[PDB]
A paper describes a structure:
WD repeat-containing protein 5 (WDR5), a core component of the mixed lineage leukemia (MLL) methyltransferase complex, directly binds to kinesin family member 2A (Kif2A) to regulate these mitotic events. In addition to transcriptional regulation, WDR5 also functions as a scaffold protein, facilitating the assembly of diverse protein complexes through its WD40 repeat domain, which forms a β-propeller structure. WDR5 has two distinct binding pockets: the WDR5-interacting (WIN) site and the WDR5-binding motif (WBM) site. Emerging evidence suggests that the non-canonical role of WDR5 in mitosis is mediated by its interaction with Kif2A, a kinesin-13 family member that specializes in microtubule depolymerization.
Two nearly identical WDR5-Kif2A complexes (RMSD = 0.132 Å, 291 Cα atoms) were observed in one asymmetrical unit, with one model selected for subsequent structural analysis. Structural analysis revealed that the Kif2A peptide adopts an extended conformation, with a short 3 10 α-helix spanning the central channel on the smaller surface of the β-propeller disc of WDR5. Notably, Kif2A Arg117 occupies the central channel of WDR5’s β-propeller (WIN site), whereas Kif2A Ser121 binds to the edge of a unique hydrophobic pocket (S7 site), formed by Phe133, Phe149, Pro173, and Tyr191. In the central region, Arg117 inserts into the WIN site, where hydrogen bonds stabilize its guanidinium group through interactions with the backbone carbonyls of WDR5 at Ser91, Phe133, and Cys261. Notably, the hydroxyl group of Ser121 forms hydrogen bonds with the backbone carbonyl of WDR5 Lys259 and the side chain hydroxyl of Tyr191. Upon Kif2A binding, Tyr191 rotates approximately 29°, whereas MBD3C induces an even greater rotation of 79° than does Kif2A-bound WDR5.
Author numbering:
A (entry chain D): 114 to 121
B (entry chain B): 31 to 334
Write the structure that this text describes.
């Protein structure tokens, strides 16, 4: 996936 | 006055979350990046799919255009950036050196440099022609969520989950200014205003703030949207009325009056977090894009 599409 | 953005096109085709959309400086194109490892190029005025650009080994978190609209740079979970020739789709260079996901990227106006930020807590400045990393800035203590050049390229602004916004001298690499506010919530997005006098910074306490960074004063705040978990792009809209534009975790696009701070419009239609918005360089057109349960880009147009 991509980091920006994952929540912190 | 309030804008009247209406939905014109929904662009489907990515198979995972969309992470970022950007209009080309010449207005003709929209580029999108996705967790599906692909960049797609679409016609900005008719929404027609143009082409797919591939080669990253993991998903992409950002994409940016060169000033002449001929190149793209992308930032990927595979720890690299790639520079692409838009007309051929070919990867011209692979920028290696970050030690964790690359999160954000941008060309300078001259477009001889690229700036990147990464989960490895650094900011890197790269030579476009050679692909060499020219400088590595130990910029932050946590992942770097955004990087942006000002209008003459002499400054970089960076933001991070460590709660800091920093302004850097491009040529010397030194930190010119550190902005801190309240209890230092994570800063999830930052960019310069078009004239280079202000910065717009998002923090994960549901707040956007417009700063005079040289004087270190907060001039405006924009609230009412939902932003606690994701690095959502925000924008200055300047082709018509002067608006602030942002996505939101309640699946809406928010538009505020920049001076009064009032919400002037909420755009409905996405079905997941609106991670990215972009404003067309000459027409009153917004592009928006959303995460895994939506996977679409929407194009909106207003009379002002």
């Amino acid at each position: 996936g991509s980091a920006r599409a994952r929540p912190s | 006055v309030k804008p009247n953005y209406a939905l014109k096109f929904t662009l489907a085709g990515h198979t995972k979350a969309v992470s970022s959309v950007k209009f080309s400086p010449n207005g003709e194109w929209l580029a999108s990046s996705s967790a599906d490892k692909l960049i797609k190029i679409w016609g900005a005025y008719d929404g027609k799919f143009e082409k797919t650009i591939s080669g990253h080994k993991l998903g992409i978190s950002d994409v940016a255009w060169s000033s002449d609209s001929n190149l793209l740079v992308s930032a990927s979970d595979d720890k690299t950036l790639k520079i692409w020739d838009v007309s051929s789709g070919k990867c011209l260079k692979t920028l290696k050196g970050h030690s964790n996901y690359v999160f954000c990227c941008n060309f300078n106006p001259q477009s001889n440099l690229i700036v990147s930020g990464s989960f490895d807590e650094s900011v890197r400045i790269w030579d476009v022609k050679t692909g060499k990393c020219l400088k590595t800035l130990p910029a932050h203590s946590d992942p770097v969520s955004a990087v942006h050049f000002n209008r003459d390229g002499s400054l970089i602004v960076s933001s991070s989950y460590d709660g800091l916004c920093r302004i850097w001298d491009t040529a010397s690499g030194q930190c010119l200014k550190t902005l801190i506010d309240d209890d230092n919530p994570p800063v999830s997005f930052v960019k310069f205003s078009p004239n280079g006098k202000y910065i717009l910074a998002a923090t994960l306490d549901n707040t956007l703030k417009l700063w005079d960074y040289s004087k270190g004063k907060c001039l405006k705040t924009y609230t009412g949207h939902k932003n606690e978990k994701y690095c959502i792009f925000a924008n200055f809209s300047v082709t018509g009325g002067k608006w602030i534009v942002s996505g939101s975790e309640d699946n809406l696009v928010y538009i505020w009056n920049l001076q009064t701070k009032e919400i002037v419009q909420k755009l409905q239609g996405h079905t997941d977090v609106v991670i990215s918005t972009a404003c067309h360089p000459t027409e009153n057109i917004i592009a928006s894009a959303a995460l895994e349960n939506d996977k679409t880009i929407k194009l909106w147009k207003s009379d002002c």
